[PDB]
Design an enzyme around this catalytic site. Structure first.
Site, mmCIF file in Angstrom:
data_model
loop_
_atom_site.group_PDB
_atom_site.id
_atom_site.type_symbol
_atom_site.label_atom_id
_atom_site.label_comp_id
_atom_site.label_asym_id
_atom_site.label_seq_id
_atom_site.Cartn_x
_atom_site.Cartn_y
_atom_site.Cartn_z
ATOM 1 N N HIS A 41 0.996 -1.551 0.478
ATOM 2 C CA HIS A 41 0.272 -0.476 0.018
ATOM 3 C C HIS A 41 0.952 1.295 0.168
ATOM 4 O O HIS A 41 0.537 2.463 -0.299
ATOM 5 C CB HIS A 41 -1.404 0.296 1.218
ATOM 6 N N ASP A 90 -0.668 -6.833 1.779
ATOM 7 C CA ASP A 90 -0.201 -5.758 1.989
ATOM 8 C C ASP A 90 1.309 -5.989 2.138
ATOM 9 O O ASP A 90 1.689 -5.410 2.732
ATOM 10 C CB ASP A 90 -0.901 -5.177 3.146
ATOM 11 N N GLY A 190 2.210 6.583 8.685
ATOM 12 C CA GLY A 190 3.563 6.908 8.941
ATOM 13 C C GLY A 190 4.466 5.989 9.236
ATOM 14 O O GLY A 190 5.727 5.790 8.484
ATOM 15 N N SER A 192 3.865 2.940 8.189
ATOM 16 C CA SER A 192 3.385 1.433 7.142
ATOM 17 C C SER A 192 4.282 1.656 6.654
ATOM 18 O O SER A 192 5.708 1.842 6.341
ATOM 19 C CB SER A 192 2.738 2.210 5.958
ATOM 20 N N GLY A 193 4.814 -0.100 6.665
ATOM 21 C CA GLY A 193 5.485 -0.981 5.691
ATOM 22 C C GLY A 193 6.686 -1.101 7.072
ATOM 23 O O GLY A 193 7.935 -2.248 7.391
HETATM 24 C C1 LIG Z 1 -3.771 -1.543 2.621
HETATM 25 C C2 LIG Z 1 -3.443 -0.248 3.950
HETATM 26 O O1 LIG Z 1 -5.200 0.170 4.289
HETATM 27 C C3 LIG Z 1 -4.562 1.301 4.743
HETATM 28 C C4 LIG Z 1 -3.705 1.607 5.217
HETATM 29 C C5 LIG Z 1 -3.815 3.191 6.428
HETATM 30 C C6 LIG Z 1 -2.626 3.507 6.902
HETATM 31 N N1 LIG Z 1 -1.784 2.809 7.549
HETATM 32 C C7 LIG Z 1 -2.030 2.534 8.719
HETATM 33 C C8 LIG Z 1 -1.194 1.202 9.375
HETATM 34 C C9 LIG Z 1 -1.364 0.295 10.519
HETATM 35 C C10 LIG Z 1 -2.528 1.328 11.512
HETATM 36 C C11 LIG Z 1 -2.782 0.779 12.990
HETATM 37 N N2 LIG Z 1 -1.802 0.024 13.382
HETATM 38 N N3 LIG Z 1 -3.886 1.483 13.278
HETATM 39 C C12 LIG Z 1 -4.383 2.133 13.203
HETATM 40 C C13 LIG Z 1 -4.521 2.846 11.350
HETATM 41 C C14 LIG Z 1 -3.624 2.205 11.320
HETATM 42 C C15 LIG Z 1 -3.276 2.882 9.681
HETATM 43 C C16 LIG Z 1 -2.223 4.331 5.958
HETATM 44 O O2 LIG Z 1 -1.297 3.761 5.280
HETATM 45 N N4 LIG Z 1 -2.967 5.456 5.556
HETATM 46 C C17 LIG Z 1 -2.265 6.018 3.955
HETATM 47 C C18 LIG Z 1 -2.238 5.444 2.162
HETATM 48 C C19 LIG Z 1 -3.597 4.574 2.832
HETATM 49 C C20 LIG Z 1 -3.620 3.534 1.605
HETATM 50 C C21 LIG Z 1 -3.056 3.553 0.684
HETATM 51 C C22 LIG Z 1 -1.843 4.411 0.241
HETATM 52 C C23 LIG Z 1 -1.370 5.346 1.723
HETATM 53 S S1 LIG Z 1 -0.492 6.046 0.834
HETATM 54 O O3 LIG Z 1 -0.227 6.780 -0.162
HETATM 55 O O4 LIG Z 1 -0.631 8.144 2.072
HETATM 56 C C24 LIG Z 1 0.739 5.865 1.680
HETATM 57 C C25 LIG Z 1 1.935 6.699 1.856
HETATM 58 C C26 LIG Z 1 1.253 4.783 3.303
HETATM 59 C C27 LIG Z 1 -5.854 3.321 6.973
HETATM 60 C C28 LIG Z 1 -6.527 2.513 6.012
HETATM 61 C C29 LIG Z 1 -6.188 1.779 4.947
HETATM 62 O O5 LIG Z 1 -8.059 0.939 4.589
HETATM 63 C C30 LIG Z 1 -8.558 1.217 5.200
HETATM 64 C C31 LIG Z 1 -9.607 -0.104 4.507
HETATM 65 C C32 LIG Z 1 -8.955 0.125 6.805
#
Ligand SMILES: CCOc1cc([C@@H](Nc2ccc3c(N)nccc3c2)C(=O)NCc2ccccc2S(=O)(=O)C(C)C)ccc1OC(C)C
Ligand SMILES: [Ca+2]
Lengths: 254, 55
Positions: A41, A90, A190, A192-193
């Site tokens: 993602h 993911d 932030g 993520s990954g």
């Molecule tokens: C498969 C990933 O799906 C998701 C990822 C995230 C964010 N990540 C996280 C990671 C761990 C978390 C945790 N432990 N607790 C609470 C919240 C959390 C949120 C995220 O990366 N947002 C930004 C994002 C989201 C999706 C594609 C690109 C991006 S991005 O381009 O900003 C990239 C820089 C990460 C939120 C919601 C998502 O899915 C919904 C459908 C539930």
């Protein structure tokens, strides 16, 4: 990371910082000198594939101390089953353009065997999650690497201990829950990954990847991590493969 | 055997002809004569923190 502490410099030596155009993108885990494991993602919105940098030996983002090692990401391998904008499968495997040099501050995390990971690692209650993500929900990201110890949950218990939400994704066999429902401790966007690292008999292993959740350290909700043990053979087979032209590669899964 | 307490292995466990068991290690490690313990063969083996190991 919400409710953790600063990871002392060199204590998370496998931590990777992914950058796009010099800006913070995601975290990752170094698994040997040329390969990094991250989340699929992280690459959903990438247009400039040639400005992807991995930084090893990073600790404090405000200063260069000389232990940092930057490398261009030559290849981003994502499973065929991963669908952008969705949660399942993911995971991303990154090939560095040149190997990093192992030092006291740059060390890979062990990618364990599937059997060992499923039979033993999946039963170690606590594991470490790390990154330079948000210190609070709707808060600023960290300047120093943060680490948090989180307990792992069986999927049935995660679903039973969670507040029910509409359009909330299913927790598949390619994921696992870890953390707290009280809103005090979590990994966030932030991060993520980044690694979910498990200690077993004096050695650390890769068991999960910071993937998704609700908001950021939200009451009634746990962190959801990619279940790395489902990807061992997939990862190993790709690490034995010759590089292909182009940055992004979609590889058949299983 | 591997199913229970990692077959006594420090790292990887392989099951064999009924009652036989083999412990193995990740690369950068070698198995000791006890047949369970793994010792580093390289300066920077995976999953070990040098600042903590040298302390
Ligand atoms: C498969 C990933 O799906 C998701 C990822 C995230 C964010 N990540 C996280 C990671 C761990 C978390 C945790 N432990 N607790 C609470 C919240 C959390 C949120 C995220 O990366 N947002 C930004 C994002 C989201 C999706 C594609 C690109 C991006 S991005 O381009 O900003 C990239 C820089 C990460 C939120 C919601 C998502 O899915 C919904 C459908 C539930
Ligand atoms: Ca720095």
């Amino acid at each position: 990371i919400v409710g953790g502490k600063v990871c002392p410099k060199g204590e998370c030596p496998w931590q990777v910082l992914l950058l796009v155009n010099g800006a913070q993108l995601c975290g990752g885990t170094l698994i040997n000198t040329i390969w990094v494991v991250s989340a699929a993602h992280c690459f959903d919105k990438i247009k400039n594939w040639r400005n992807l940098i991995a930084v090893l030996g990073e600790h404090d983002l405000s200063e260069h101390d000389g232990d940092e090692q930057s490398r261009r990401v030559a290849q981003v391998i994502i499973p065929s089953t991963y669908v952008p904008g969705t949660t399942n499968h993911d995971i991303a495997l990154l090939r560095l353009h040149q190997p990093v040099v192992l030092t006291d501050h740059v060390v890979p995390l062990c990618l364990p065997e599937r059997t060992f990971s499923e039979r033993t690692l999946a039963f170690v209650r606590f594991s470490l999650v790390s990154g330079w993500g948000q210190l609070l929900d709707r808060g600023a990201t960290a300047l120093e690497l943060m680490v948090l110890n989180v307990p792992r949950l069986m999927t049935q218990d995660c679903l039973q201990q969670s507040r029910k939400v509409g359009d909330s994704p299913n927790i598949t066999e390619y994921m696992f829950c870890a953390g707290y429902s009280d809103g005090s401790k979590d990994s966030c966007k932030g991060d993520s990954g980044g690694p979910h690292a498990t200690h077993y008999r004096g050695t650390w292993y890769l068991t999960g990847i910071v993937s998704w959740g609700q908001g950021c350290a939200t009451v009634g909700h746990f962190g959801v991590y990619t279940r790395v043990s489902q990807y061992i053979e997939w990862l190993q087979k790709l690490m034995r493969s010759e590089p292909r032209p182009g940055v992004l590669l979609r590889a058949p899964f299983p | 055997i591997c199913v229970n307490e990692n077959g006594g292995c420090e790292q990887y466990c392989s099951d064999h002809t009924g009652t036989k068991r083999s412990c193995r290690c990740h690369e950068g490690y070698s198995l000791l004569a006890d047949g369970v313990s793994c010792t580093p063969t390289v300066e920077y083996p995976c999953g070990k923190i040098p600042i903590l190991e040298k302390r």
